[PDB]
Design a protein around this ligand. Structure first.
Ligand SMILES: Cc1cc(OCCCS(C)(=O)=O)cc(C)c1-c1cccc(COc2ccc3c(c2)OC[C@H]3CC(=O)O)c1
Lengths: 267, 57, 335, 234, 231
């Protein structure tokens, strides 16, 4: 129902917007000294989630319109990159963050000797470039005004894409941008658990560290995971209805309130 | 012990800076007179324009 | 009854000092208008040190600077352009002091090795080699100052100070009388007397010629970390770990002012005056330096921008800038 | 900028390059600090002793699994130590050595450990504790000439925890005394710190040669702790 | 201990090739910039090439640009000069010149013996030769097309004394001070483009040619030289 989607979108905005600003505030406060790579990733997660939060009002108005696109088409395309670019990139980001934890847990001396914030900035820019190219190129290679598909005798926004073209095109980016980072996140997480099991301060602190490190996996599986599962199911079984896919959008958009207080922890 | 004798002799000699003890008001007046006599020279009190500031950016 | 007459003499000291003073410097200087808020701007940030800094010293020409650090290097900076004139490796990486000769020819250093190393900057070979290695102290050196490019004054952790002759290399004079570790020096502008503070809340004024403690000042309650003469040479300021500075007059032989506030609780690591002596700059453990009015004892300014403990402070002879070095391996010049 | 200024800037750049090379080379190694008392056997913790940089302070170098170790000992100073100790505030760990054979000086060792643990500058520095002369303690407790309870009354009212760590199956009184001493030291250590720095107790003899391994493992654990706390995982 | 010995000179043919070697001992050669300086038999000194410290910046004179190569060898402390396509104007004596640059250095303190090889800013001396009487005070002067005073309060003028059959020394550098080992009777002064050097009381060892140098890397031109004859 449109009412349910509108209510959950407005709730997600009303919760994420205050959480993200405090997360950024704390991240900058801690980043005032020594520019820790963990803070480098934390700022990126905060910025990406904030861009999603400022994108939510447009999609909420769209859901209220129930498939229509009240916003002028000139701002339609910039809307997509304003809502889908950080949705996937954040999924990659955690992996890199998790990778760092692995390096800090299995190879302590080497990581301490070889740690430098500029390397984290470089890999952060690399993931930006990868996600931007891999989605922008497939935006224009397959997709009248660009980004708008109009049904016959119906009001006109990326949801009227034919399944034949949208199946492989969506699946290619869904597998590379989510499954590949997910594998790294899982492997680094199990390595981190093993390293903590080797030694730690106290059992309570071992459990606390395990739970804090588990935020990456919890976010990558609980919210973005269902959305990519719907994406791949659409490619595999195009006959499936769009209700599951659209509910995947809600599940993914819940990340802005899910991860900031779990993966961030600086709020 | 000789340490006590040396300490007592040191105190006796320190007493025999009693003549050097000037009135505290006079010392403070001299310090003031110096401060307002040399207050113009230093650049830390009065900021100096960058034309003759060696540390201009 | 030597002990009894010791406290008898210390008791009469109180009577003599009380009879010497009738009022305080605050009443005398109350008529002076306040200096006002002072905002000091950073001009240069001398970077290149890879370890925390303990000591620095300006040059007589007011342009060259020397800095020591745990990295094991003495670095000479051209403060105008933030260059690196010289980088001298050290035999021992533990150094707690450094000195620049008035002629700009020699540089002294020392630390947890009981040896004061003196390097000749200007050589025909074009490099810097160890001119001398003065040894004989039985504790860590805390400070060292060049007198006239041919004799040096040091203080060590064996509760004593010494005056060495560079050519002979032996202790020309030895100053003793301190109970705890001596941690500071200050040569008089005429280089005839010098004060030194120890880890007993006690400063001592010594004559360099006769080699005897002319005067003793007390009044703190913790270790003394810094000391500096007034520009005229008739007074000096002292910093200690009890979060307070104190101004002493040699002739008055008493406290003059106490610079302290409830906000500050941390110790004091360095103390310096201005060219005219109106401003007292003191480095603290609160990651920043404070600037007090000498004749008013109020916080006239705060120098912030260091992200670690401030360990060394120095005002140039011209008085046009003040350089601060902290444990973050960064020297900042302010004016 | 004239020609001479450009040449001076080039000289400064070369000096900077040499400085970075030296700094990374120094960052490669790992540093330590040795603390102890007289006749505590702190000079034989590592079976090989190096006279490198012979001065008022002893400096020793060793290596384990292709990582280096600098160990600094002080013997030329006076009784007071709180002044120069601020120099050793960035070391990886502090090796404390305690002679557990004798009982008169155990209280002095405990007081010294309490002073080091609660020092204002060594707040975040971990301590590796070595209990030297374990065989002498075993002989003393087996002979029974010197009663342990004469100095510590609480030893008599103390029971051994159900932890069968000693594989050789040594005499139960030996294990009780060892665990009592370790319990005292870890109670002094754990009373303050809130997890910023922790102690690693160990038992060593004058004949033991597996001391470098323990120091290496403890340093690895400490670096792991630093990395985990850096990522906000503690 | 400071010694610079040159080798590799002799008879060559036009269009040939030659190598000049400069061996330096007694000082830290790896921290000193080096210069190759030409002096025609009957004309005077002329700059040729400059190699920096650490083999960084390289500067060549306009006449020898594209033909002369200068290289450095720190492990064996040697300076190499490769010369190709020699001409009739390249016959002269070549000197190896030490140099060092920081805030208060003397960048022309030492000169090599040099070897004889046989096959901008104009800096004009006031005179070419003046007679002098021992015991009294003499003065020399020279001018430049452009004022040598810089924006940082430095004027880059250098004074060199060349006694016959002897490698020239450095007397006054930057007008700031007297080089080490120079008796405190020479005085330097002047401003803008015109500078003067005065000797208060000559002796028998002050006979020789006096050159004045401006310090700009590309021109690096000398002066004409006003020799003093004892009379
Ligand atoms: C490439 C481009 C060109 C462009 O030209 C401006 C108009 C010039 S004119 C009038 O002459 O035409 C403007 C923009 C904004 C872009 C752009 C830049 C970056 C990302 C994206 C979208 O990227 C997505 C968005 C959703 C999807 C994309 C790509 O593929 C999948 C699917 C949904 C899904 O994720 O499943 C457009």
């Amino acid at each position: 129902p449109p009412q349910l989607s509108f209510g959950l979108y407005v709730a997600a905005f009303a919760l994420g917007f205050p959480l993200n600003v405090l997360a950024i505030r704390g991240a900058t406060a801690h980043a005032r000294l020594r520019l820790t790579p963990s803070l480098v990733y934390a700022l990126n997660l905060g910025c990406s989630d904030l861009l999603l939060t400022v994108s939510l009002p447009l999609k909420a108005v769209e859901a209220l319109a129930s498939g229509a696109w009240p916003l002028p088409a000139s701002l339609c395309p910039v809307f997509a990159v304003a809502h889908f670019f950080p949705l996937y990139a954040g999924g990659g980001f955690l992996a890199a963050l998790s990778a760092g934890r692995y390096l800090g847990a299995a190879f302590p001396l080497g990581y301490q000797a070889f740690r430098r914030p500029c390397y984290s900035w470089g890999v952060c820019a690399a993931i930006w470039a990868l996600v931007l190219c891999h989605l922008g190129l497939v935006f224009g290679l397959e997709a009248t005004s660009l980004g708008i598909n109009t049904p016959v005798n119906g009001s006109p926004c990326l949801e009227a894409w034919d399944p034949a073209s949208a199946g492989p095109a969506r699946f290619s980016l869904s597998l590379l941008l989510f499954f590949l980072p997910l594998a790294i996140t899982a492997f680094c997480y199990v390595g981190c658990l093993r390293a903590l099991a080797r030694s730690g301060l106290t059992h309570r602190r071992k459990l606390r560290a395990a739970w804090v490190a588990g935020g990456a996996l919890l976010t990558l599986l609980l919210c973005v995971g269902p959305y990519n599962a719907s994406n791949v199911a659409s490619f595999l079984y195009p006959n499936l209805g769009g209700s599951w896919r659209k509910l995947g959008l809600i599940t993914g958009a819940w990340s802005v309130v899910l991860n900031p207080l779990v993966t961030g922890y600086l709020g | 012990n000789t340490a006590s004798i040396a300490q007592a002799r040191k105190l006796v000699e320190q007493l025999k800076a009693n003549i050097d003890r000037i009135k505290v008001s006079k010392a403070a007046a001299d310090l003031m007179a110096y401060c307002e006599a040399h207050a113009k020279e230093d650049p830390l009190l009065t900021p100096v324009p960058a034309s003759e500031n060696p540390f201009r950016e | 009854q030597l002990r009894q007459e010791a406290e008898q003499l210390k008791n009469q000291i109180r009577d003599a000092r009380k009879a010497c003073a009738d009022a305080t410097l605050s009443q005398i200087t109350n008529n002076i208008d306040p200096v006002g808020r002072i905002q000091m701007r950073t001009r240069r940030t001398l970077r290149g040190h890879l370890a925390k800094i303990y000591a620095m010293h300006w040059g007589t020409d007011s342009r060259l600077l020397v800095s020591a650090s745990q990295d094991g290097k003495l670095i000479i900076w051209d403060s105008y352009t933030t260059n690196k004139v010289h980088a001298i490796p050290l035999r021992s990486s533990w150094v707690m002091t450094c000195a620049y000769a008035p002629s700009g020819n020699y540089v002294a250093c020392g630390g947890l090795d009981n040896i004061c190393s003196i390097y000749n900057l200007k050589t025909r070979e074009g490099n810097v080699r160890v001119s001398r290695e003065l040894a004989g102290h039985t504790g860590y050196l805390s400070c060292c100052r060049f007198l006239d490019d041919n004799q040096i004054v040091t203080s060590s952790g064996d509760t004593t100070c010494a005056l060495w002759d560079i050519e002979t290399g032996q202790q020309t004079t030895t100053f003793t009388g301190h109970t705890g570790d001596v941690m500071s020096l200050s040569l008089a502008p005429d280089t005839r007397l010098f004060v030194s503070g120890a880890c007993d809340a006690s400063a001592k004024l010594w004559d360099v010629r006769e080699g005897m403690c002319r005067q003793t000042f007390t009044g703190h309650e913790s270790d003394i970390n810094a000391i500096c003469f007034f520009p005229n040479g008739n007074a000096f300021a002292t910093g200690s770990d009890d979060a307070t500075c104190r101004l002493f007059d040699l002739r008055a032989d008493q406290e003059l002012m106490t610079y302290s506030h409830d906000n500050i609780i941390c110790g004091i690591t360095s103390v310096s005056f201005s060219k005219s002596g109106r401003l007292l700059l003191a480095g603290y453990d609160d990651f920043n330096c404070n600037v007090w009015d000498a004749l008013k004892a109020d916080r006239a300014g705060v120098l912030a921008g260091h992200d670690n403990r401030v360990s060394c402070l120095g005002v140039t002879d011209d008085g046009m800038a003040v350089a601060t070095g902290s444990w973050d391996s960064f020297l900042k010049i302010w004016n | 900028l004239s020609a001479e200024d450009k040449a001076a800037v080039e000289r400064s750049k070369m000096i900077d390059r040499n400085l970075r090379e030296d700094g990374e080379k120094a960052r490669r190694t790992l540093r330590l600090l040795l603390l102890g008392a007289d006749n505590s056997g702190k000079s034989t913790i590592v079976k090989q002793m190096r006279i490198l940089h012979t001065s008022g302070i002893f400096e020793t170098k060793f290596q384990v699994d292709k990582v280096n170790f600098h160990m600094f000992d002080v013997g030329g100073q006076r009784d007071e130590r709180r002044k120069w100790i601020q120099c050793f505030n960035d070391v990886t760990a502090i090796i404390f050595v305690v002679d557990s054979s004798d009982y008169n000086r155990l209280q002095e060792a405990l007081n010294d450990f309490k002073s080091i643990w609660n020092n204002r500058w060594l707040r975040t520095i971990s301590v590796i504790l070595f209990l030297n002369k374990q065989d002498l303690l075993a002989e003393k407790v087996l002979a029974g000439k010197s009663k342990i309870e004469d100095y510590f009354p609480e030893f008599a009212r103390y029971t051994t925890p159900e932890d069968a760590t000693p594989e050789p199956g040594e005499d139960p009184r030996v294990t009780r005394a060892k665990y009592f001493i370790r319990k005292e030291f870890v109670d002094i250590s754990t009373a303050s710190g809130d997890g910023r720095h922790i102690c690693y107790p160990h038992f060593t003899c004058a004949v033991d040669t597996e001391n470098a391994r323990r120091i290496f493992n403890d340093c690895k654990d400490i670096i792991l702790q630093m990395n985990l706390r850096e990522y906000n995982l503690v | 201990d400071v010694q610079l010995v040159e080798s590799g000179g002799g008879l060559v043919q036009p269009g040939g090739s030659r190598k000049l070697s400069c061996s330096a001992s007694g000082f830290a050669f790896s921290s000193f910039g080096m210069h190759w300086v030409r002096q025609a038999p009957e004309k005077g000194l002329e700059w040729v090439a400059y190699i920096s410290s650490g083999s960084g910046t390289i500067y060549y004179a306009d006449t020898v640009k594209g033909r002369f190569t200068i290289s450095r060898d720190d492990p064996k402390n040697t300076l190499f000069l490769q010369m190709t396509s020699l001409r009739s104007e390249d016959t002269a004596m070549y000197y190896c010149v030490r140099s060092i640059y920081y805030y208060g250095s003397s960048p022309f303190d030492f000169w090599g013996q040099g070897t004889t090889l046989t096959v901008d800013i104009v800096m004009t001396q006031a005179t070419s030769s003046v007679p002098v009487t021992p015991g009294e005070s003499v003065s020399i002067s020279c001018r430049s097309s452009k004022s040598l005073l810089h924006s940082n309060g430095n004027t880059y003028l250098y004074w060199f004394l060349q006694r016959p059959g002897q490698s020239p020394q450095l007397l006054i550098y930057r007008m700031s001070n007297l080089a080490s080992g120079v008796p405190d009777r020479f005085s330097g002064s002047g401003s803008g483009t015109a500078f003067t050097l005065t000797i208060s009381r000559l002796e028998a060892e002050d006979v020789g040619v006096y050159y004045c140098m401006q310090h700009l890397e590309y021109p690096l031109t000398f002066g004409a030289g006003t020799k003093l004859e004892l009379k």
